[PDB]
Amino acid sequence: ILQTVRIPSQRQAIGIEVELNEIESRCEEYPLTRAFCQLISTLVESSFPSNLGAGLRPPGFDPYLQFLRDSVFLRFRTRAYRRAAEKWEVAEVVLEVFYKLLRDYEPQLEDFVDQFVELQGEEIIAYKPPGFSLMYHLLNESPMLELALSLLEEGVKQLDTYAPFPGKKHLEKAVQHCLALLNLTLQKENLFMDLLRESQLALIVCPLEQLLQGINPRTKKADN
Amino acid sequence: FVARSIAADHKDLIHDVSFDFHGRRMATCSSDQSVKVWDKSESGDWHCTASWKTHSGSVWRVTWAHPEFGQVLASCSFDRTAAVWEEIVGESNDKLRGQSHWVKRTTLVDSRTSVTDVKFAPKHMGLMLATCSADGIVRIYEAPDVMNLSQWSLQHEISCKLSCSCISWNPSSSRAHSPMIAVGSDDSSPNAMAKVQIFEYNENTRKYAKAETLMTVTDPVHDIAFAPNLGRSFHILAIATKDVRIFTLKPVRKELTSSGGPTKFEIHIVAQFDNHNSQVWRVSWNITGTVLASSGDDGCVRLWKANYMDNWKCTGILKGNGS
Amino acid sequence: EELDGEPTVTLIPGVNSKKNQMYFDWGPGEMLVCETSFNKKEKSEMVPSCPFIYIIRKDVDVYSQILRKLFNESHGIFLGLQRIDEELTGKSRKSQLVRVSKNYRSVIRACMEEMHQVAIAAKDPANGRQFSSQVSILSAMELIWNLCEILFIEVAPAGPLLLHLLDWVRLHVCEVDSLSADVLGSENPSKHDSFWNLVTILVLQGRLDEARQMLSKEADASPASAGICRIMGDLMRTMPILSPGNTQTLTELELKWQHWHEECERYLQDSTFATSPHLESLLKIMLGDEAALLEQKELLSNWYHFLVTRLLYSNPTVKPIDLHYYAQSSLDLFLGGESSPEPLDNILLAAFEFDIHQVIKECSIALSNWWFVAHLTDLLDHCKLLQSHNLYFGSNMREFLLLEYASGLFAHPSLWQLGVDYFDYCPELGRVSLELHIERIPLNTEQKALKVLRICEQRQMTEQVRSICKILAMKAVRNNRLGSALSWSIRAKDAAFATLVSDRFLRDYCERGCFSDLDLIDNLGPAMMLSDRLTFLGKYREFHRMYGEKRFADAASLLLSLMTSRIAPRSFWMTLLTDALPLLEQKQVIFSAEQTYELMRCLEDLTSRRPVHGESDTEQLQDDDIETTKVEMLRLSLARNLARAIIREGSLEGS
Amino acid sequence: EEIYAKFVSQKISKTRWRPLPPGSLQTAETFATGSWDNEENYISLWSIGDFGNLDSDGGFEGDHQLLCDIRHHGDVMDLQFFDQERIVAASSTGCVTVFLHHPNNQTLSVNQQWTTAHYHTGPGSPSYSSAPCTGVVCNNPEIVTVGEDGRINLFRADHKEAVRTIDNADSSTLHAVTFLRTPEILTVNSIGQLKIWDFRQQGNEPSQILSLTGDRVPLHCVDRHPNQQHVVATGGQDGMLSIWDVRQGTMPVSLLKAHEAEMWEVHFHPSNPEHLFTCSEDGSLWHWDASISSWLSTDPAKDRIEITSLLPSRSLSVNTLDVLGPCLVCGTDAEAIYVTRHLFS
Helix, strand or coil: CECCCCCCCCCCCCEHHHHHHHHHHHHCCCHHHHHHHHHHHHHCCCCCCCCCCECCECCCCHHHHHHHHHHHHHHCCCCCCCCCCHHHHHHHHHHHHHHHHHHCCCCCHHHHCCCEEEECCEEEECCCCHHHHHHHHHCCCCHHHHHHHHHHHHHHHHHCCCCCCCCHHHHHHHHHHHHHHHHHHHCCHHHHHHHHHHHCCCCCCCCHHHHCCCCCCCCCCCCC | CEEEEEECCCCCCEEEEEECCCCCEEEEEECCCEEEEEEECCCCCEEEEEEEECCCCCEEEEEECCHHHCCEEEEEECCCCEEEEEECCCCCCHHHCCCCCEEEEEEECCCCCCEEEEEECCCCCCCEEEEEECCCEEEEEECCCCCCCCCCEEEEEEECCCCCCEEEECCCCCCCCCCEEEEECCCCCCCCCCCEEEEEEECCCCEEEEEEECCCCCCCCCEEEECCCCCCCCEEEEEECCCEEEEEEEECCCCCCCCCCCCCEEEEEEEEECCCCCCEEEEEECCCCCEEEEEECCCEEEEEEECCCCCEEEEEEEEECCC | CCCCCCCEEEEECCCCCCCCCEEEEECCCEEEEEECCCCCCCCCCCCCCCCEEEEEECCCCCCCCCHHHHHHHHHHHHHHHCCCCCCCCCCHHHHHHHHHHHHHHHHHHHHHHHHHHHHHCCCCHHHHHHHHHHHHHHHHHHHHHHHHHHHHHCCCCCCHHHHHHHHHHHCCCCHHHHHHHHHHCCCCHHHCCCHHHHHHHHHHCCCHHHHHHHHHHHHHHCCCCHHHHHHHHHHHHHCCCCCCCCCCCHHHHHHHHHHHHHHHHHHHHCCCCCCCHHHHHHHHHHCCCHHHHHHCHHHCCCHHHHHHHHHHHHCCCCCHHHHHHHHHHHHHHHHCCCCCCCHHHHHHHHHHCCCHHHHHHHHHHHCCCHHHHHHHHHHHHHCCCCCCCECCCCCEHHHHHHHHHHHHHHCCCCCHHHHHHHHHCCCCCHHHHHHHHHHHCCCCCHHHHHHHHHHHHHCCCHHHHHHHHHHHHHHHHHCCCHHHHHHHHHHHCCHHHHHHHHHHHHHHHHCCCCCCCCHHHHCCHHHHHHCHHHHHHHHHHHHCCCCCCCCCHHHHHHHHHHHHCCCCCHHHHHHHHHCCHHHHCCCCCCCCHHHHHHHHHHHHHHHCCCCCCCCCCCCCHHHHHHHHHHHHHHHHHHHHHHHHHHHHHHHCCCC | CCCEEEECCCEEEEEEECCCCCCCCCCCCEEEEEEECCCCCEEEEEECCCCCCCCCCCCCCCCCCEEEEEECCCCCCCEEECCCCEEEECCCCCCEEEEEEECCCCEEEEEEEECCCCEECCCCCCCCEECCEEEEEEECCEEEEEECCCCEEEEECCCCCCCEEECCCCCCCEEEEEEEECCEEEEEECCCEEEEEECCCCCCCCCEEEECCCCCCCEEEEEECCCCCCEEEEEECCCEEEEEECCCCCCCCEEEECCCCCEEEEEECCCCCCEEEEEECCCCEEEEECCCCHHHCCCCCCCCCEEEECCCCCCCCEEEEEEECCEEEEEECCCEEEEECCCCC
């Protein structure tokens, strides 16, 4: 219903990744994708199997995080909306899933080891934890960090008017989950950065203390 | 100059050769009564694509139309005729094995004597054709349609009153000179004091009026060519005779009192070259009219150019080695 | 004056000039030649020769595959030069023109060294010699360009002129550094047989601290000469050479060099070197002894290295306006009067006389390609030195050379695009030279023809745009591609050609019952109005765009307008009458009485023109069974609409 | 980073990357080119020179090394890879040729050839006239081509004949062609239309047509988004860029100006397709970043497309480009090629 197994001959996707971009993105109303984000939002707190997708693909969560990050979140500001509130009703139910996936993940040294799995006669690396994927996407100058910090700017930029506006309570929640994500990074950052130093994995990551001082591409100050 | 070579398999003397406007095709004609078309490949080769009989006499020229009229050829003959040919896609009939896809659309027959030369007109006039013949006349024909190339109206008979050997249209697309044609003569008589004559279409009388006659060309003429016009306020004219000649023809501006008559020219000889030590049998210009070529009984094609002072000299000799 | 030698003689193989006449014609880069011989067998058993045709390409170099690098890079540099500002002050502009000169030199060098490796890689010694010959031509070009740069572009003053002329020799007389490797790579450098020759040649190039280092290998090996070799080497360190970072006068250099000469000659009077004749020769060479310098002629590979040696050791304060006399006097002494100078010597002498026009003239005789002379003359107008004087035909000398070179790029299948830009900077004759070439580009594809049309449309060459569009419309008409034929005649804006393509579509319809295109006729837009017959084609498709798609009185008045026009073909008037039958016999009167009379007037000028001629053949009858049936149904339906119309129209004159 | 230009003494009409092995971690190492407007045209295979190294004797080995060539017949109008050793090309002769690389030899050869794939006809005899084949698209084992004859052909890399032909799919030239789905293609023409064809249908007529409104802009190139079968991009005779959703009427969704001329190729990035690239007869080459898919926003003054000229100057015409991972290549009428290993630095 999300296509995790994309076939090399197949020129169109199947499931909600089509229905979001060919049906909801024609109605300018988004009930199917919000109900899918709400389905994942329960299914993280009742947990996910570590072997999820094994034998059909590499095991783990990141194919669902790719849809929520790269097909929902990074496109929530480039879609049009019949409900001027639903731009924020979509942001609430995706940042809730990311918040839960970073709340309950605690870093471990095997997150920094590339575990291999046999798949139909070839040896392939597993999908890293969704909280490790979230840490790596917040400890870099990512489009996800652009969209987080330019949501904190956009939030104050509505609130400093003191006015009522459509969907206001969902923007205040979407800011709350955005702050709580960055705070969960800072509360786990040192452990993630030292397990990277012991494991000697060939990644690069920067402290969120310092990425928060990056030049905001809107205002062109360090004003995050 | 770098040479490639081709066996031409004409079964008697070849009389003429002419390029298409793009230099992608060429035509040749012979005393064997044939014309041949040869085409240049997308590999740099040349291949014979049509080789057919055109006439009943020896063929004395072959010439192409400009390609805004498509793919059309003309040929003149000792049988007193000229013929017009069109290249057709898909007509070529196995019911009549060994005929060409170059089809004869018409034959012109009105000359009383051998048709010595044939030239298509500058395209701005229309689809027009000139021929000349040893009755001492030039004849000019017009096609009223570009597709029905069977139908040609004879619009002008032009009286030289000496035999005609060659003709040249003036290559002026500039609407500040009226239509012009120059004519050479093979006449060996000592009585005719000039062997080149020049005619102008005069709008005020609607016929080719005789504007000028080159009273320094006492000697028989075998070929004649106007130089392509790089914007010049004056024309340049090459002539093949006992020697090579290059004339200038600069229009005298009419006063606002000389109505109805033709123009007149300030005429010079800029060059006369004996250097062939023999008669001259063709004169043709490069595309910009800056270099002349001419051939003779010395077995040399000789090249001629202006220097920076308009002093014309020989610049190259293309000649056979016989090895 | 110009062209006072023999006119360049090409030999043609097989062709028997010894009595045989010739015919010829001109194409874009090739001239045809054909011979008048045909060998009608006087009884000998041999094969009879057919006549032969010859294709004679312009000689000039443009087809050498490596030189296409030189032509594209020097088009980039030429367009970098035609985009320099004239107000750029005579220090910024002179530095920038010296860069443009050194850019052009870099391309000659980078084509020559590529061609040198290709000459080494040549698996046939014939091909290796053909590349090696062109390497020598590129070397001669960069030798002449390095001199013309020093004299006319950088314009070296007295003092620095000798530094410029020393590295002018050094950048081309590269023999010395190769010989340095052989001598230095040996187990005993001071015992390689060429060691003393190399020590002398380094002194003849003024490379005095390199010559000191070679003399050190005699001093390390030979403790008997070493003391005297070090006096020579220390004189090779006291020589006053000009230093570009150093705030001295020419008179200071002059007075110091006069002391150095008065000290070198002093060591010759006390006979200091008369124990080694090689060191005695080096002292005479370093004193400017014109006899000892000519004893070194087998170590001076050319007269201009002898000249620069003679300036280094006999006149270090030489000026441009002294220089001619030393150049001639060094050519005199090097050739001795039993040899004539070569074409390169005549060019280099004229450069030392500073006659830019004699240099341009002899370069136009010694170099097979206008490429050199055109780019050099262009750069010397950017220095404002020239026959920017008008010629007898209006254009200037820079333009006259660019026109022959641009015509030389149009003589090649690819390079004609560069040839367009080389015509746009030619103000008197460039445009007309372009307008005579541009229609003759082979139009193999519509895509190639779009590039040529774009070039003509940019430059407002509007009758050539009409020509090329009619050549494309006629490509399409001979191939029956009616959509390209109509679209190209619309770009040509020729109403007779637009009518003629409509007089294919309207027959192609009758030859099928349908058109070979519909979308092309529907999307005519404003271009429908290019003729009456194209307007009729668009409007008969528009009638056929109400028959599945709309109504009736709109369609009927359109049908009558199509019929009564001078535009409907009369072989189709029986059809347009038949097309009225479903509109005439309607319960609503759709044509008026007045309109029904014009429909009958058209049926009458169809029917009243059948000839009354008799009896042959039988198979003709069975469409006259049908024609009479067509005509009677038309009489009956037109009379029925007329009666219904008169009753409807006359009652609206009566209430 | 900086871009490594090379003169090759032939105009380059087409360039293409060699397809990478599925599940490899290589950059694009090898490309193919085709040439036009010579006395002799060619198809050539090249490696990207290695700017990372010098050895003891100081030689610059960082040139784009020629691996091997083969001579062509006509101009190389269009070019595509078919697998990791085979290539297909069109021609001004109307010929279509499949070639094969030989890694064990460093040579090219013909593999199969359709010498009469495109041709114009005439009244009653098979004396056909040459029609330039203009575009080629592959769907291994299957191949499709277009031309001046307005013909569509379907060919196969196991079969010698045409599998299907459709003469006069237009009365004008067809310029380019792409697959929407395996039996379902889209073509572009001299009128300013996109015509859609389904090889399942037993008629020859189009399954759907799209156009501009009335005034004719010929459409020279076409591509279709790697993750969206319904999203199409086309390039005009004017230098406009048109984005279409083929399911939502007859018109483009988004209309942008890209050049001051004829736009010769348009491509979506094969892994990053919210990025686009274009080349033209205006002498320029551009990258476009837009990260609903941003190409389908009807207001590009709200939603972004941020736009970069990749060439530091304007040359003679840029006929072609290809982009694979971080690598990009283009080909020009300046008898030259331009390459980078890195587009994101």
